[PDB]
Structures are given as structure tokens and as C-alpha cells.
RNA sequence: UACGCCGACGGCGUUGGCUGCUCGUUCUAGCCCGACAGUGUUGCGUCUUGCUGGCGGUAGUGGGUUCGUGGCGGCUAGCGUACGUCGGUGUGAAAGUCGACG
RNA sequence: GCCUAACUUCUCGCUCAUGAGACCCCAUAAAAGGUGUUGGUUGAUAUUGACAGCAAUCAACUAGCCCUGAAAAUGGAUGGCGCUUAAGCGAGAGACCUAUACUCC
RNA sequence: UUUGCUUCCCGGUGUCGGGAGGCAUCUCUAUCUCGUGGCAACACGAGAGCUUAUGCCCUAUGUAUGGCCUUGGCGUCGUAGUGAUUCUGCGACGCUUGCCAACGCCAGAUCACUCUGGUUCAAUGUCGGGGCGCUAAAUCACUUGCAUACGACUUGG
């Protein structure tokens, strides 16, 4: 069941825990996972619940030496990484090797800026009742100490503009391809018969 | 993102790249200095400025 | 925003469960979840089904509250619901998938050959168009 | 006793070889040998280079395609003793038997209106592609 | 010269050795659990019951098996699928020797014989 | 050739696991017919068309439920060998190969 | 649901808590309260048009969930991560996982 | 690093593991797509289980000869663009790549499967030949005192 490549998952409109559990299962099963736009992941419940939970998490530090205590990562990518870590036997070699196969990013790095991302419908936020508040990990990270919200926003805006231009060109070329098949009809009529008879169009 | 150095660098500025300047051959920036008076080096410097 | 509604006479398509892939007519609504449907002409018995298993089609019959099997059948053949449904892309896709699932190895080979030839020709024409 | 032949396995059926150096080849089945119970099959050696040999039915997928095999007349000296194992070298006798058995099969394939696709199918090897799960494929 | 209809693709189903049969604090290494590609029910998993499976791994010493032309670093462990496991399409398998735990997440080839279609 | 050390495919014995049809058996209808009572009721008011309720029928049609000291199948597992079909290797060293421990 | 072998399986409800709740012994919570929401009981008014302003309404109760009552000292515990038409609470259904237990070898 | 060495290619040779190809808009979930009118809001008309990632590409005998169609892929080089450093577009040049006569004709076989895709692919180390190509630094010991338990730190030849 292993995938040849890494699984690229768009984090937008995904429930934190559900996506984390699915990704942890995949990592344990042997795949590599890349999560993009970790700042677009959501957590159910009003913002205050998540904010106070993270504040209580921040309060957990070693009294003797905080440099030893829990390390409270503020970036959305590291937040998702730690959430997945919690779902792995990370204290063992199996869990460590599984966790080292995960990459979580804020925004879409140039390496993956030109690939198709996946979604897990079982982890989409649209399973929540419409009358249910939810927070965004980007806002939570910004309010708990993340310092690169605006930079990522600007980079994402530039990326979206470029993608929109590319999609306009692709729409034009797709219309052109439809017209090309229409023109080719006389030559391909011999084969289109077989295609349609076997049910493929 | 990038750094562009002046064509001529003072000896005391180049000393900072050394722990044994007097004992060395003092070769720091010697090849870089020649880029400024070269056709390709000038193109690279202009690209860095851009 | 909502055009198709769960109404008496609405023709529904059983998406999942017992009679998957058939059509029936709503003859009663028991509650917000359960609806009594009877597809006599589509080989569906008068039963109660969860709306979670049903999908609304565009055909509504002129039925009466709790119309009996006879009346719903008469309305079904009068409206010709099955022909019109078969005309839709909804049914065309289902028929295509049914044909697909039953392909043999030889048929798969023939399809592959014909498809690649068609793709090559269409690519030639697409290059022609792109040059202009 | 001899092994029982699978119902889908009848003379002239095209089988997919699942093991050996010829794995994935589409061959044509001639008859079940009586002594060993194996399958005397020969994808026409002209097309896919599969010579006249034996193969157990446990390592073949019996496809629904059936080529007209009524015309081939198998020599009487072809049997389990003939195929029994002695640097192997094909014998000039083996060559003549292969040609003798294959000629009517090739003629029957040629007369078929789909002879083009039939020759291509017998010359191509089977494989699993993207999203091709054997439990859902109808062979 | 081209060998006149060469190989064109894989002739096995992809699987991964996900672990041994276990409870929570127990483990039976006599049986292995495999997750196959494209199998999502016990109904589908039952189709592969009785099919042979192989695990290929790389060793240091090279061996020249009869029927091969070149010494190879790869060895194989053979086994067979015995029955489905659970509801989600996993299968139980039994190998000639107990699968090494180092094969976790590594490729297992589910061959299409002995055939019964 | 036989035999030793290992494997594969069949058969048989045993213990099974999964999955279908087909007969009947128990308790029961619905469809269909008749009168009465009601009404979430179309079309144009002790109207009509619908629909419902028990009640009385059941000819024909006819599903649910229950299981049988029933009948007929399909796939497949472990263990053993009514036993077969066969492959690797081993008959001076040695090297390689195979087997077992590890 | 993932740690963790076995379903993000199926049906109906209830619950939003500015750290809700989450399974015998078991690892604390009460009296008293809420015009939060969901069901019920009783008594009235109302189409001879019921309450508010110049077509149902009113009153008293009742019990499910939720909230207040509810304060301790190293940083910390439904076991953890997390979970909100749940991965919570209650009633249920299929299947599945798993003992040194049962059957057989 | 005046012998040593970077880089590229050719060859040996060690070690190591993996185990069937490719795919780019967003926003939105109590609406969406197409066509037209609109600066915009929006409007009109036609549709819409939505299973186009439940998809689409790719998907294999070798000359020759004749008939088609000239496309697609790969590599080098040159410009132009892309900054979240690589990746793109355009050429130019090379090496190939499709169908029909037509399985027409040659070749193909290892005996029934046990690791071959019947030489599978990657990563790096080292040793030999070549092609351009380069010809350094730390450290000790002295010294300095803004530094110093010793190391360390700041200076100079």
C-alpha cells in the first residue's frame, strides 16, 4: 500500500486532530508526508478555548531549568508536527523513524509550489455543524508568539496571483484542446467508436 | 541574499579575514578584485546589484 | 439556493444500501430522517428509507399523500421518468461505469490501442491549433 | 488420478502465464496432458516466442477470449514423455513440431476479423497498471 | 535485438508488512499482517487468500543461484496469505521463516498464483 | 536410476474459516373483493377522486418470520502423509551450490 | 481515531462549557440556584378572535444535558495526543480484535 | 596547498539500502459551471450526485521497400524570466518517436514456478587514465593587555 512518492496534503480546511491521526498512521505505515499551508488548519471550538489551552501548555516548564522543560513551538508547522508526534510512539526507534518522515510548512515552499496537493475528506472541517465556531492555527500562532504571519501572507498572495495567471493560460489551452479534438473528429472517428463502445468517451 | 564588495579593499580591511596575515600570502579578494575589470565579472556584479 | 426538495412525488435515486442504483417515488414523509418510497416500475418495494441513503432527482410526480402502489406506478409510466433519467448525464455515467467494470483483458487491450491512437491524432491537431 | 481441470479452461482459451521467464505472456491452451495433468499450451512461437511446452494450471489465468483451435491436429508423439526433462539446446525436431502445431492456429487467427488486435494481444504481455486491482478486474 | 514481447510492468500486488499478530502487550511472530494496495474490505481481502507472497531483501554475501547469470545480493523469504484480518482489508500471512521486524513498511510482493479465477 | 537434505503443485485424512443458491416447516400477512366509519385529499360539498381504520372474505397472486435428524455448490487455512507430479543440490578434491544452526 | 491488534462502520436523540465530558473497586463533592436548552405533569385564557404596541398564550411544577455554587502551594494529567451531527452523554445494530481460558492436532 | 588538488568524462573496485512511470489556480460549503450583458453589484438563458484522483496521460519484435502524419519526448548550448533557487518559456542544434501493406519475412526456445525487469535501480568511498582549471591556510613558540584559575579572548612580526 506504500506510495512511491511523498504525500503532499493541503492543510487548508482540515481538522487538526483528524489530519494528525491520519498522517501519523501513514508515517507509521512507511510513507513520507508533506503538509502545506499549516497555518490554514483549523481547530473546532471558539478561539478562546484554543488560546487558553495553549496558555496552559505554555505554563508547563521545568522549574529547575526551563531550557530543559517543554519546548512550546509557536509556528503552525511545528504545532502540527508536535500534534502528530503526540500520536506516535516517538520515545522508541519506530516512532522516531516515523516522525522523521514528516515535513510541515507554513505556505507552499517553492519546491512544492508546482505540484497537486491532496485532501482527506474525513478530516475536513465541513463535517462540523455549521453553527459551530472554529479557530485557525494561523491566528492561534500569531497570538501565542509566531512572528511571520504577515510575511507568509504576502508570499501566499504573490503565489496565488501567479497561480491565477497560470490557470487562465491553462483554461485557454484546455479550450484549445477541446477545439482540437472537435477538428480531429474525422480522423479519430474510427477509434472513438471503440472508445465509446467500451464506455470511455 | 547577496553581498557586493568594493573593487579595492584596504589592507587593514582584508586583515580581518586572517589570524596570521603577516605569515600568509595575503590572497584574500585577489580573484574577486579582477572580476570588476572583467566582462563576465562586471555582468555578475550588475546582476547582484539588480 | 435549494431547488430540489423532499416532497410527495419527488423521484429519488437510491445512492447506497439495499436497492442501490434504482429510482423510487416519495409517497410519504415519516419524519425529518425517514421517508416512505415505492418504486414499483423500477423494482423497488414500498419501504421506509433514511434520507441519508437517497439522492434527489429533477423529476416530481403528481401524486397524492400515501399514494398506493397502483397509482404511483401509473404516474411513473405516465411521466416516463425512466427514459428521461436515462437521458441525463447522471445515468450515462452510471451506465459507462457498469460497462467499464465488466471489461475483459482483450477489451482492455483494444481500448488501450484505440485510446493511444486517438490521443496521438488529437495531439497533432492541438499542435496545429497552437501554431496559429 | 489426474488433476481436475478448471471449468473456465477449455481448448483454445487464451491464458496469462503467471510464473517463469514467460510470466505475463498470453498463450493459447491446447489440451490437458493425461499423465502429469499439466497443460499443453503454446502461444504461437512466431508471435510471442513462447515455445510448445507444459505448464500447471495453478500458474495460469484463464481469460474469456477463445481462439478457434479445432483445426490443429497434435502429433501423437507429443506427450509427457516428449516434454520430460533430459546446457539445453532446442532440437530441430522441436522446431518442426512447433511449426506443425502453430500453423493452423495462425491461420485461424488470421481469418478472424479482429486478427490485428488478436496478433497484438498475443504479442503483448499482461501487467498491472495504475489503479488496477486484480480482485475487481474481470479477466 | 529486442526479445519479441518483453516485460511491460509488475506482475504482483504491492503490500507492506505492517506488523505481527498481537494484542496490546503480547505479540505472535508466527503470523504477519500485510496491508495491500487497493484492498479496503474483508470481502476483497478474501480474494487474495491462498496466494503466495515474497519478501526481497539485500544481503552482503553475493550468491549465484542456478538459473541466474550474475551473482546477486538479494535474497527472498516466501510465504502465503492465510485469511483476511479485520474489516479494512488487511490480511494475515504465514512465511517460511518468521518475517524479520526490519521489514516493517517494506515492500512485499503478492503474486497472482496459485490461481483460481 | 535409487537414496539423503530442502522447496513447489496436486490427492487423501483431520480440525476448520468465509460465502452462496434450493426445498420445505412454524406464526402471519399484503395485493385482490364487499359493506361500514373517518379524512394530511385532486377535480369541479349526504359530490367526486384519493387515502386510512378495523370487520367480513381469499379464488388467484403473494412476500415477511422460524428453524430443519434437510438438498446442491464456491473460495481457502494449519497439521499429517490412502500417495503422486516435479525441480534444486550431494557421490575424488577444492571452489561454487544446497541444508542446518547462528 | 493514533499511540495499539480491531470501523473515523450503521440508526435515533441530547450537550457548547473564557480548559465540558469521557466507563465497577477508583482515586471527592453537597445544600441551594439559572427566563441556557430539551422532554413531560397540572390549571387556566383563547377564534362570542388569547399575551405586547400605541395565533396560540399565561402560571406553577417536574427531570435529562450544560452553567454557578467549586480556593493551595515544583509544571501536569479522561493514561497521552487530541476529539465538538465527537473520538462526549443515553438507547441500540452489524462486523471485527484479543488470554497460559474452550475445541482439535 | 609547485608537488598537491577542485570539477567533468571514461574505466575498475568496495560498501551499502530500496523494489514498477507522469499530473500546479484560488476562494467558497445555505450554491457551482458555461454563454451573454455589465466599471461593479449583479441580471438573463441553459444546466448541475458533483463517481474528471472513483480521473487523465503513458503502456514494448528487428531490418528493409512503398504509402501516410509530422507530432511527442530526451541531451547540450544561447538568450528572457522566475528568489519562499531552483524551476520555466523561447529558440538552435543533435538522438530518437507514430500508423497502414503486415506478423509479409528473419530472430526468439534454457524442459513446470521458487531473488532477476530473467544484467532492476539508487547512494556514496577508493584506485587508475585523460579534458579544461588553481597554486592556500590554520597551529605551536614568542609578543600584546581591553582578557585570563588552566584552556580561552584581544593584538604584531
From TrEMBL, chain C:
Domain Large ribosomal subunit protein eL14: 46-119
GO biological process: ribosomal large subunit biogenesis; translation
Pfam families: Ribosomal_L14e (PF01929)
Domain of life: Eukaryota
Gene3D superfamilies: 2.30.30.30, 6.10.250.2270
A GO cellular component annotation in the UniProt record: cytosolic large ribosomal subunit
SUPFAM superfamilies registered for this protein in UniProt: Translation proteins SH3-like domain (SSF50104)
InterPro entries in alphabetical order: Rib_uL2_dom2, Ribosomal_eL14, Ribosomal_eL14_dom, Translation_prot_SH3-like_sf
GO molecular function: RNA binding; structural constituent of ribosome
Protein keywords: Ribonucleoprotein, Ribosomal protein
PANTHER family with a match to the protein in the record: 60S RIBOSOMAL PROTEIN L14, LARGE RIBOSOMAL SUBUNIT PROTEIN EL14
Protein family (similarity comment): Belongs to the eukaryotic ribosomal protein eL14 family.
Protein name per UniProt: Large ribosomal subunit protein eL14
